[PDB]
Amino acid sequence: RTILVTGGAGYIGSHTVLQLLQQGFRVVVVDNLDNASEAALARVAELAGHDGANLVFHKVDLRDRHALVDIFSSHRFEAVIHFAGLKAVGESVHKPLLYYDNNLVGTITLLEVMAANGCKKLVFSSSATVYGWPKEVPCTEEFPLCATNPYGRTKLVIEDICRDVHRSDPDWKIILLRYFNPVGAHPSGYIGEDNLMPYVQQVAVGRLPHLTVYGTDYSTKDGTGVRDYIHVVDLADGHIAALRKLYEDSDKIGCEVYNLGTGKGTSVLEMVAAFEKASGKKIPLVFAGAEIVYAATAKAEKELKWKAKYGIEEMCRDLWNWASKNPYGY
Amino acid sequence: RTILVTGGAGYIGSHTVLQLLQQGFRVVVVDNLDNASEAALARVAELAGHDGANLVFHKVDLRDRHALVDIFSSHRFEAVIHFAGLKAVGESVHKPLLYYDNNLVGTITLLEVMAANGCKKLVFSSSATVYGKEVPCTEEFPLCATNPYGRTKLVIEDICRDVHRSDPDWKIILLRYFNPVGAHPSGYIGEDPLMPYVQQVAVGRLPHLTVYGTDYSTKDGTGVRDYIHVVDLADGHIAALRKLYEDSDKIGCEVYNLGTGKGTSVLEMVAAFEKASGKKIPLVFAIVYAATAKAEKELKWKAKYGIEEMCRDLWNWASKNPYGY
Ligand SMILES: NC(=O)c1ccc[n+]([C@@H]2O[C@H](COP(=O)([O-])OP(=O)(O)OC[C@H]3O[C@@H](n4cnc5c(N)ncnc54)[C@H](O)[C@@H]3O)[C@@H](O)[C@H]2O)c1
Ligand SMILES: NC(=O)c1ccc[n+]([C@@H]2O[C@H](COP(=O)([O-])OP(=O)(O)OC[C@H]3O[C@@H](n4cnc5c(N)ncnc54)[C@H](O)[C@@H]3O)[C@@H](O)[C@H]2O)c1
């Protein structure tokens, strides 16, 4: 039983193939590796132990169609999990074509090769920046959508391409997942990343002088911004939950949308406190000049049979655990 | 002065490249003849006469990055008019990927080579189908993609707005238009695929026209859409390209409406064609406007032909070429 995972060498993707491997799956990963290193897949393989053999890695770009058609004709892939993409808001503005070319062309070629190789089961990882900054929280899947930046637009376009493909061929079964701010690392502290918590962690180890808190007078309990965080191990279990919805309850759902997350938001000060407790270090602050945004996960918990298991305190534990062991990444 | 025109071999593309050659512009046309035929460019060079020797034609696909960078490296360009694209709303639904591939990827590649070889002036052939209310559709009208072909147009219409934010040196004009009708008054070049259908009825290949919607909120009870002479459309882009050159400080990524500012019913157009052609159009029965005030104010452009000249030129090109080229 094989699953193909694009951008599997990345942060969310590497934690994905590990849980996949551990739960009896052959995982084929496709990565350009411009945003990551091979070591992450060598370590996810080690963490998988005897299941390390099941992981197969292809250093190939999703836009390359010939290299991609070869992969899809070498296995019957039960489904495809699409992580490949670029995830930098500031970078997407100065270089919008660089984002539109990578995200849009990469997905289109992917959807084409899949349809041509009889693989029409997809799970796409989408960003919850599509809701924009709304007046009302919690954000439900019925909330209106808007694009704050080219990165957000490129994500919202893919969602529309997925919807259009579904209406063109009812054989397509797509699940679109939206989520907020993955944080943490594998409890072993052997794989991890390389937003706020990264900045907190680099100043907790000494690399940075302090954490600058932007905004101290918001309409929140403490006055600092409230965002939606989610344990990365929890989020990588969310993408798998959808894959089971595709395997068991496929008939019910066609190109459905489930947004993931803990369901509650926490503030910068609430989050710094949760990291000082787990870390034992004390991050200095310097005060400088949306107040709240978070995801309503009621839908996911009901239809997808999924619920986050880890709170903010174990997120910082694991983040500190991996980072303190690996200060220079890989 | 050299202009690059993509999709210049078909209809609006063929007519515009003709009126660019006629105004002293060395024009390089890029087209992979998917929907058009090469004869349309040969016969455009003829109608240009002496200026016909300024038509450089490269049968290449915009999604072929290496083929495209050769064309930009040799010719030092001044601007690009992007007609290239797939227009069939019908198959855009059943084959959406084919549309996102050809349109989105072909456009993103062109934009990359342009900014690379130092040429950041573009005129885009958008579509007013992005309007998806109030009878006159202004540019500020809320945008609404109704199908995959419409969303490719709206996506490309957002990518340019994003490109301009990243590099202020980019000057772009987005031209939204709908329902081009007619051909060159000579009748030597035109469209070779509602007017095309009523035409085939007059020329005998079709038995009758099918009027879809005999009840509507209109005088005739039939739908009312906007129509613009293809020759009006062609030099409508010329007015845009004229703003990129003469007044390209004020403008950023501007969007303009091209049309006559008036709407025609279905029975009015067929009634018009029955006069201009003399042949009657049997019918078997089964509102969109353009706010041209902006374009005629800041572009110095107003459609010069009317619905009578559209059927005249369309019946002229069609009776002289009943089987295309
Ligand atoms: N060039 C290509 O087309 C291509 C091909 C194959 C793989 N890749 C790879 O895909 C990998 C993606 O991994 P990554 O570590 O950059 O991203 P990631 O693993 O942190 O996230 C995976 C995907 O989730 C998206 N995302 C949505 N909301 C997010 C949030 N709140 N935080 C973070 N990501 C969010 C990202 O845009 C990304 O596309 C990269 O390593 C890249 O090298 C690219
Ligand atoms: N090189 C490439 O990238 C590439 C690939 C495939 C096709 N093509 C070419 O693209 C050209 C497309 O031109 P065409 O022959 O369709 O002529 P056309 O005039 O119908 O289409 C060209 C432009 O006019 C617009 N248009 C015209 N009528 C319209 C209507 N009723 N509704 C909405 N928009 C309308 C379209 O938006 C399009 O951008 C063809 O000549 C084909 O050969 C180019």
Author numbering:
A (entry chain B): 7 to 200, 207 to 301, 307 to 347
B (entry chain A): 7 to 138, 141 to 201, 208 to 300, 309 to 347
Reproduce the article's own wording on this structure.
BZU3 encodes a UDP-Glc 4-epimerase and plays a key role in controlling cell wall synthesis during the morphogenesis of maize stomata. BZU3 formed a homo-dimer, with each protomer folded into two distinct structural units, the N-terminal NAD+ binding domain (residues 1-189) and the C-terminal sugar-binding domain (residues 190-355). The catalytic site was located in the cleft between these two structural domains.
To further address the molecular functions of BZU3, we solved the 3-D structures of the BZU3 protein, both in apo form and in complexes with NAD+/UDP-Glc and NAD+/UDP-GlcNAc, at resolutions of 2.6 Å, 1.25 Å, and 2.15 Å respectively. BZU3bzu3-2 failed to form homo-dimers, probably due to the frameshift which would be expected to alter the structural folding of its C-terminal domain. The highly conserved NAD+ binding motifs (G13XXG16XXG19 and Y157XXXK161) of the UGE family were indicated in the aligned sequences.
